[PDB]
Amino acid sequence: DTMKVINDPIHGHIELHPLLVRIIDTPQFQRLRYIKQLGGGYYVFPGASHNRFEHSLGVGYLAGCLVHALGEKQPELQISERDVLCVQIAGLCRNLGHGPFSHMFDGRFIPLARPEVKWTHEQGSVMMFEHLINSNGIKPVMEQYGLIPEEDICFIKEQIVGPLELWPYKGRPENKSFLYEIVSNKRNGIDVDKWDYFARDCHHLGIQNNFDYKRFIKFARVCEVDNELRICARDKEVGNLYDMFHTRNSLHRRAYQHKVGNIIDTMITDAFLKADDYIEITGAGGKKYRISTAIDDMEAYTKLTDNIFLEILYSTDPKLKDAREILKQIEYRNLFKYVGETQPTGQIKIKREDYESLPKEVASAKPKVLLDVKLKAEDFIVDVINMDYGMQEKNPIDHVSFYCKTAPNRAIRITKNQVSQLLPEKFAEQLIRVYCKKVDRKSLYAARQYFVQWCADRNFTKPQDGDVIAPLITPQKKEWN
Amino acid sequence: DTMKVINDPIHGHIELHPLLVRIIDTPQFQRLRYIKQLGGGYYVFPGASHNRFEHSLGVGYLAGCLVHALGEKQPELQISERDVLCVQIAGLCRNLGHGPFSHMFDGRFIPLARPEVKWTHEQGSVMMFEHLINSNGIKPVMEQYGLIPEEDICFIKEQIVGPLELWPYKGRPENKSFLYEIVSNKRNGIDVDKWDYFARDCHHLGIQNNFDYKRFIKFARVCEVDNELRICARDKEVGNLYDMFHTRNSLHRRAYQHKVGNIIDTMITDAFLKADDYIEITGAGGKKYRISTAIDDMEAYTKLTDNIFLEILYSTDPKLKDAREILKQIEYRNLFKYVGETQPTGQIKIKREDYESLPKEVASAKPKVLLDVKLKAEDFIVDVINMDYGMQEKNPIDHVSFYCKTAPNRAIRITKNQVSQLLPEKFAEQLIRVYCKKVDRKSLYAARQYFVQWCADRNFTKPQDGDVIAPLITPQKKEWN
Amino acid sequence: DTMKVINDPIHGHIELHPLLVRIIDTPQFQRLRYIKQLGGGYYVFPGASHNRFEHSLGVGYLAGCLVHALGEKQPELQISERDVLCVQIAGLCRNLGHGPFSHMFDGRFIPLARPEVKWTHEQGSVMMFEHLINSNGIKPVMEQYGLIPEEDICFIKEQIVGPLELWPYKGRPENKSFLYEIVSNKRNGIDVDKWDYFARDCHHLGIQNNFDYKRFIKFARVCEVDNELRICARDKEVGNLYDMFHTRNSLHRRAYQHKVGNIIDTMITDAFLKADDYIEITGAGGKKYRISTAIDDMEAYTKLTDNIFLEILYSTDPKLKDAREILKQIEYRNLFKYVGETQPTGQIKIKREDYESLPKEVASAKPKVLLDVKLKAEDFIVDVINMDYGMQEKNPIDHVSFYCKTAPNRAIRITKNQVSQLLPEKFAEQLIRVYCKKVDRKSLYAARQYFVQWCADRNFTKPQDGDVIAPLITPQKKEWN
Amino acid sequence: DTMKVINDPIHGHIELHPLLVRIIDTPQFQRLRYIKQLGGGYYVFPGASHNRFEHSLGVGYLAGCLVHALGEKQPELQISERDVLCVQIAGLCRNLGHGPFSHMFDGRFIPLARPEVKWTHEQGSVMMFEHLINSNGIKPVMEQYGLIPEEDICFIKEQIVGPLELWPYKGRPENKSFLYEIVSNKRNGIDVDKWDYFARDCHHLGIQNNFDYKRFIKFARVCEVDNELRICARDKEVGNLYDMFHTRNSLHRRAYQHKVGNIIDTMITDAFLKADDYIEITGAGGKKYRISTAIDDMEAYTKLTDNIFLEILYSTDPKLKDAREILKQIEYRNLFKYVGETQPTGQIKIKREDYESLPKEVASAKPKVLLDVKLKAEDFIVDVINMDYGMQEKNPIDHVSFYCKTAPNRAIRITKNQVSQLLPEKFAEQLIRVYCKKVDRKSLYAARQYFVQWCADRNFTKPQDGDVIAPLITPQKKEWN
Ligand SMILES: Nc1nc2c(ncn2[C@H]2C[C@H](O)[C@@H](COP(=O)(O)OP(=O)(O)OP(=O)(O)O)O2)c(=O)[nH]1
């Protein structure tokens, strides 16, 4: 065994070490070929055919680039080949736990199908990784290339998910703290996973990525901060970091939360729920699981991919008729209709436990207009979306350490007013989308009136098209005019 | 209904007329989302996740651009909105007939599973189109937008497949002859399908496309040639046309016929053959079909996509054990091993009926070397690939009509020696690849010796690595040295 | 004469009407080949070799695209071929008035060399255009193609510079009001000049352009707003407009106001000032002009380009020794040294009349540190830069008209809180850069201390590297820590 | 001093060692900012504003990448930091000798102005480099970074120009032979200079570059070939090498030898010839040079750039009237007119000594057509262009060494028939362009007839538009029809 070269349209020629090749050439990894990076987004942006597999390659490559670059610039850090391999492996392997349609699965489906469980793709990635290592005799191959499985497997898992339980990490000591900032940066979110997806999703969506990760890597150094060694950015890159999260937010606004992409994810999720009793997936020892319980057995989860969409779509069992019908409406483009969007005002923040009650409230609003049809709670869908800079109300740049050219080893902080008065004052907001399940002309008109009345009742922002969709409702509200 | 916009990473914002949108939003069209443009290539180039669906959109868009451009430049042609829509529909619909993994299906699987039938994706596209139209009540919508179904459906079919039987076409008369050169150009192969796939495949593969279709469109005119009106290129674009086919050939060399991509296609094909008795696909009136017979019922063919790969992979039926095992070897990357490549010499041309006997000949060669193991016909795969400029021995530029700036209405011909002595002297060749099903170190070494000996016996070209893989064999052949 | 095609790396193949070709093929237009778009930026970003000439072609092309697109979508507007040509010509010709190194000339040099005059490149473009038309017998060619010079020349001039003096425009009536929003949009700054430079500058600088002008053009419509017909953007594009000005601001931050690019512009300006008495440029009737007075005669201005830099650099006249020395220091990279950057606080806004007194204040600060050398007012340069969204304190999106899909003919307004809480709260700010003319290690250290002390004295923001460059000064200020 | 970073739109962030920075920040290097890479091409492709400066940076960067890569993959080669710097310096400095408009200068002007001298830009680069080193005290800086000027300056000069006089090189011994194959590969022309210009010219011209140099670098190794250590390509890259020269040829066909670009270069050359008696350039010790003699003194040559075009254009001296007039015709686009293009037939090859007599032969042809005007030898220009794969008649791939994956240290050869029957049979050809200095309609018509008759008389290829431009002449020739 020697090194392999892969051509990636984002990164060009990526060299893979033979150990990485062995990890990649397993069912658990190859599975990622059959899970779309952006889920329902492909049904809006037809370039976004890409899957988690190629993204994982890119993340592993970039993890390698950053760690090599630091080591070249600063030999005093004592970064070993062993460290490099462990970081690359973590990079490759942090997407392993994703399920059908990526964020649809852990973001929409599991929460609705198994509300008692608490589950994340990060957790899944750890479990899948364990299963991958054990099912495929990787440990011998690791030690053949100088790894120490007890330490190193812990290190890898920790990079993906955080401390498995004061320095809280057991895979590496504090002098190598900076290594935990590469693959999944818990402190501020500036990590190579983002860098790959910005460039890859833009390339496929047909929009333009504003962020130069190569520049950033070139200006990255390790400096002591509070008795940890941390990655530090050159002071002047601070604008470019602000812009990085601006770009993240734009991609979410235009693509990842596109209103139609999300309603498709919702329809798919409904279909999965209706099929969950009847689909069976064979796991370990011939035991059988549902879509919703495949997460409890990694052998079954291995076989859970975008394929279930098509298994349902192509089924003939009458038990699956309901689920199949929903997916067929997706193909005919008979989708639930978008009514509008709004935001909460001032202090108001909407909690997860209230989400269930929001379609009720909308149906309860009492618009003063003549309506032929009357709509019920169940006719409305209300999607609440939390947009932030990755740390709820917090500014992640306040958690970044910088250095200046005249003292490269001295870490510093930079505040917002030290950069620009043109930056955002807040770093978290919520969007509320409302859709109607009844798609006819008269139902849609009514839904608009309930929606706008509801916005007025709750003192939300005026929908942009409020005066056009609901001309009789909007005048009642003073603030709107 | 009004027009829709789609964002494509190759073409940007594509406007779709409502009629085109109605055609697209059907199960027969949406099916294309689940068929990879490049089949097994995705397993070698991980950027090549793209499907036939986004390619079809691109082809329809480009068909519209070209026909608009001609009409703008030359109103005397009397191109109607009706003509435009019919050309766009043909452009969208010429990929409808592809099956699982695209060219794998009609190039490898169907020929092996049903040698008596003569089947092409083109034929399939016509049948699928008919099915699509009838299953979805499109005819009323066509006449709603000014189309005449009897004429226009014929026109569309003819564009895709040629005359359904002096002027052999019934969809349009000779004065509109040029329209048949847009979507699928039977005369020289210069059409918008190539243009989209060059650009789209390069974007995804991560290689660079040499061909400027926009330029070409801007210099295109219609001129009288032998009492037909034909599309003509400006004289000076002749070098760029030569280059267009050079590019086609390079893409085939590096990507579409990559030796590993092809062996994966072969392994998948094998698995499909072993599964063909046991997989059942439900067609019209609940009737049941095999993978190989789904092409006889369009309702079944609708449900025949890349999904069968995963149906086989994830199956538990012991009847499918053999098929499942082959696909599992693909995931482990336990592939049949490449032995080498060679070409025939001088006049020698290998016919399709001899393909079956080639693994026999290789096993029959008698290399003078000590061999621990001895290999049989069934241990060898021999892939023969015909590379040309799209017209076997012929130079497609001899079938192109040009015009010069001083007489824009006078069509002319340009010969090869009028352009360059640096062009190819031949326009067709064959490549022969040989692989071994026994993958161990000793089997592989033996296979190399049989291979090189066989090349010498048949007076083929010396493999590039001949002197390294078979140092004892290569000296016997004088021509090689 | 017929149409010409030009290949542009940004837009591809641009068709030019013969009239446009005639305008282009004049000394007054071709002059733009010898003026760098980004001036001193080329000395920091070596890909930025591009000149105003190619940018002007792009602007004219884009002006044509937008006006065609509107006309196609809305024939009721009665846009004529005549209207199209006039808009294209305005687009081509709005950069005619730029001088050596573009914004360096009107932004730095003329203000310093002739403070009594008020001069802008826009004014210059009008004068140059008149000169171009008259010197080259264009009027006959205009009427040959259906233009009416009295009306149309006024129209073109007005598009560039505004009303030459209630509907204030004479070139076209109110029913064609929208045409004045294409080339140079006085209302909100959303025009095709920006769209070309975003794309062209990015392509050359090696940074990525976030803005999709093609998308924007597709969603543009004309709607009645207060008895004017105005261009209107689709409501959902409002995020993308915000992002457009965000991008503008980033390009200014990283490129157009790069601290070194600006100091180079300053050094060049200094050299021009020292050479202004001795360089002579022959204008109309053999009369002679200086660099600073060439703006009074268009014949002379025609011959004023980046070439003067090299005329000075290569000169042997001892009268030019001082000017030549400054340029030579640019080649040796002996530049004035950057000391730091800071901003005013809260309400504080610095006016143009106080700029001259700022180097005085810096020298007057009294840092408590041991200094080997002592610096005077003349050793400091203080560059004050006003960054905004193009309308000082105003939000340009408040001056944009939108429309919704359910009422395409009804214009509406959208406020900031109707879009996002993550947008900027202010739309203008100031940056202050300080440089030192004495470049040695000890002078530089001193300058850092004066600078930081001065910042503290004026209650400005703490320089990002304050604690590294001036560790003894920064503790005195409470707010900083 | 520490390292600098430069952002290039082709290569991204390039790191420059301080020594390289010192070389770059000199008048002799910075001079390259004012010489256009493609000369008169900018007047056809307006994106081609790029200068030799940014190209040189790219070449130096790429030289560094290749040498680093070889050293990383094969430490046994003993490549030192010293070796790396010397290769980078050579890469930066191989363009130093170019003159105004690049190839126009040594290809057209010098040969005509000083036919007795034998001069190349390569020779110039060596002299400029010597001048650069001595004028700027670089030798001390070289030794400060571990270079040995006697050896290393020789090494650098040798890389650019070859042996300055059996191992013929003195800068390095045979064991470091491969280092001479990086910057200017005398054996086969595969070097980093091409790689930068392919990518940079394509980016600016707006055409697409087919060559992946990064791929090629990754597969490059050093192997023993005939007791030299040489750079070797992986066997399977052989198609990609063929393609590299195919691309070179296409770039020459469409861009570098564009017929109008070339005639502009000719017109500029003419103007330079007419100005050469009157322009004076001050060189070393106040001594004075002409445009044509500035190559004898590096101090004068330093000041010789594209600027002379504008010095002439803007001059008022009546002695320069003739020269100024020619340049003014360029601005009005009053160019010498292209008549047509043709090639010699079969064996016929045209020698340099016959070039001067070709306009005579054309004027002496006797076409049987009625002509109002009659043209003389001096009214014709005849440009003969030798197109090849860089080695006249020879196939440069026959001078490439390859290696196979099973024996990475064993170099091999690959012949053309081992690759493809679709490759070119010849590797050199000639193109003949003819232009007319009299531009009116009747002079042009006549010139077409002389041209086509002359082609017939010499048994050349039929111009592509022969039957349109000269319908009365073409029938006389049997071979044409
Ligand atoms: N850009 C580019 N990529 C290529 C080309 N040929 C192959 N690739 C891509 C496909 C894969 O992603 C990667 C590896 O392909 P190779 O043909 O280099 O490796 P393979 O393992 O088939 O051959 P080997 O094992 O080294 O004989 O590079 C090419 O000509 N250009």
Ligand SMILES: Nc1nc2c(ncn2[C@H]2C[C@H](O)[C@@H](COP(=O)(O)OP(=O)(O)OP(=O)(O)O)O2)c(=O)[nH]1
């Ligand atoms: N380039 C780009 N494409 C976008 C953006 N937003 C959406 N798209 C893409 C997704 C689709 O392929 C296409 C159309 O999306 P739209 O959101 O304009 O259409 P949609 O039908 O959702 O809106 P509508 O039904 O007209 O309210 O444009 C954007 O900001 N930029």
Ligand SMILES: Nc1nc2c(ncn2[C@H]2C[C@H](O)[C@@H](COP(=O)(O)OP(=O)(O)OP(=O)(O)O)O2)c(=O)[nH]1
């Ligand atoms: N992208 C591309 N651009 C080209 C090619 N050939 C020329 N160009 C560029 C140069 C110009 O910007 C534009 C027009 O060049 P042409 O060679 O088509 O025009 P020219 O006026 O020389 O030919 P003509 O008067 O029509 O015989 O296209 C080509 O093969 N590819």
Ligand SMILES: Nc1nc2c(ncn2[C@H]2C[C@H](O)[C@@H](COP(=O)(O)OP(=O)(O)OP(=O)(O)O)O2)c(=O)[nH]1
């Ligand atoms: N891609 C990119 N390039 C930039 C940016 N800012 C500057 N550049 C370019 C211009 C130069 O070619 C190169 C280095 O410029 P920098 O401003 O980083 O260095 P400078 O020497 O002015 O800063 P320093 O001396 O380190 O304070 O990068 C940016 O935000 N993004």
